[PDB]
Amino acid sequence: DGGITQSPKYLFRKEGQNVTLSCEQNLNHDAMYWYRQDPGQGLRLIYYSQIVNDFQKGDIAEGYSVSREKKESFPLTVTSAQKNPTAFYLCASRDRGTEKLFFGSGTQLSVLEDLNKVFPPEVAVFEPSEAEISHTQKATLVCLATGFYPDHVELSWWVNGKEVHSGVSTDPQPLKEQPALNDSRYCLSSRLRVSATFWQNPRNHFRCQVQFYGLSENDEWTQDRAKPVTQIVSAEAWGRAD
Amino acid sequence: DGGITQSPKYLFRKEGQNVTLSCEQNLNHDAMYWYRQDPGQGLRLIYYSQIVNDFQKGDIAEGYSVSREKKESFPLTVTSAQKNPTAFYLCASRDRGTEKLFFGSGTQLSVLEDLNKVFPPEVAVFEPSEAEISHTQKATLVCLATGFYPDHVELSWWVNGKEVHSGVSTDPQPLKEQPALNDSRYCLSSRLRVSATFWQNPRNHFRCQVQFYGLSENDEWTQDRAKPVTQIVSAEAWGRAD
Missing domain, CATH: 2.60.40.10 (Immunoglobulins)
Structure with missing residues (x-):
């Protein structure tokens, strides 16, 4: 605006x-x-x-x-x-x-x-446990962003197509999967919490989105694997009626 | 909020x-x-x-x-x-x-x-012509969303990772690719206009994103082709220095 x-x-x-x-x-x-x-x-x-x-x-x-x-x-x-x-x-x-x-x-x-150590992240979403649902009446979706380097990511959640902010708890910063080693990749996690009834409607959609800021189109790729260019990696899940 | x-x-x-x-x-x-x-x-x-x-x-x-x-x-x-x-x-x-x-x-x-005809869209982005650049000093990226059914899509543009609104002109509604036939798929187009110098920086990223609202995970898929579930289809382009 x-x-x-x-x-x-x-x-x-x-x-x-x-x-x-x-x-x-x-x-x-x-x-x-x-x-x-x-x-x-x-x-x-x-x-x-x-x-x-x-x-x-x-x-x-x-x-x-x-x-x-x-x-x-x-x-x-x-x-x-x-x-x-x-x-x-x-x-x-x-x-x-x-x-x-x-x-x-x-x-x-x-x-x-070196752009040898550059890697996009892998993203996965884990559903809330039936135990949390029928105890807190709340549902927590977990998102794990893993094996990326360097720490060039932005995570966000999308419910039914719109980005949401309330109910979202994301780590302040990506952490090395192995602080010990130097050429260690990073990982990041986030949680989205919604009402149990909202999570139990099969028509409700949930998506964890991670924007990775990687290599540009012009930047030359020497390696064999697909080049780690800027991209979006997502994991999604639909509501699960008990 | x-x-x-x-x-x-x-x-x-x-x-x-x-x-x-x-x-x-x-x-x-x-x-x-x-x-x-x-x-x-x-x-x-x-x-x-x-x-x-x-x-x-x-x-x-x-x-x-x-x-x-x-x-x-x-x-x-x-x-x-x-x-x-x-x-x-x-x-x-x-x-x-x-x-x-x-x-x-x-x-x-x-x-x-006829869940037989439900189809996600294909998305493509076309770069501005060298003629528009050195005449209007503006650059127009075109996005074509094609062959989807039904008309369940939302298109948006992302410049350098952030969704943009100014410089965006999208059709008010998807149009049948063949008004004649009934089982006709839809298509949609949109234009994003940026300054020529902005488009000429190779480090600038441009992405056309189309959210398709399709089948749910539970909804049963009879056909052979991949099921037309809710998903995101994108097309991107980096700045091209003349």
Whole structure:
């Protein structure tokens, strides 16, 4: 409804590769910004643009470039010269001076050379136990997202076609399936709780959806297995009348 | 945030089959209603419930049954006795008397027997022409949903993982691929328009998603081909730098 649109939530950058993060707004704001979140001092300005064709460097502008051909777009390019390991890039827009800034959803740019360890997740849904149903009169569906790398996923639930939020408890973050090993894949779980009668109607549909942010179409795939491109992996279940 | 949840937007009912449409609300309303939309007089009350365990018939209550075991749920059952062809069922809740009614999203119940012709759709996305790009500086992605039956679909667009609405023009309704023939499948199209520079960034992802409301897990599949169950069919494309 008129906001900021930037690059996907997760992106890949191979050592010595040029990547551009889009950023567009339909708020007719003159000023736009690009920040990088450094664990040390939080948000830090990379570049800033007051009006079309103008851009002022920030303190960490070393390795990045921007353009402002049009008022709506302020693309940030992370050049191969950029030696940063991985970071969160946030885009923002405002009127000017010291007015209110509007922020984009943010993007994590993960830097790595090997794409051998990249894997989409497998998703499964487990029905509520007959014991929970006739004790709490509630039904809990469990979703397990497993064996994916890196931790580039977003899980959501869809009941009868619409995404739901209430009754949903998802882990705050994916966890290594084996913290011990380093080249360990991640797993994530979530629970959706609905009324027992709602779960017992055979016409009710339940779907766990996991968006995986993986390799792009252009990114070259060396291995034999199907390339781990951005994709959606789902698991679904219909209501089960007792 | 606190509303009504009813059966999916589209449902199948075979001749002489009993179907139940769920309806639940977490507004703690005492009164709940079920309407049927008849092209003739618009919304008409089927059943009404003032408080737990009580339900008053409407004028068209012939062929339907309802229960009100709990305050939150008011399930409507369309019995095989119901001789209606296809209709829109809307659920609502209120405090009581003549207070304000809150409406569910609605459900179309399509009646048919040749489950032989039920078909999920095929989805394809076509890139913008290099001519449109360097003339309008805009890019238009086209999505074609084809060969599905019945017209039980919802199309949406996903840019970089987030569903978008602006720049989206979708047909108001699916059209028969051959109005002539009766057992004709449907098709639907939609266009998503983005800036040329946005489409030229190889890191930008575009996905056309079509939710098909088909057969349930329990519904028996006689044919040989994979059963046309509820599912999601997508087509995607990445940005193409000129």
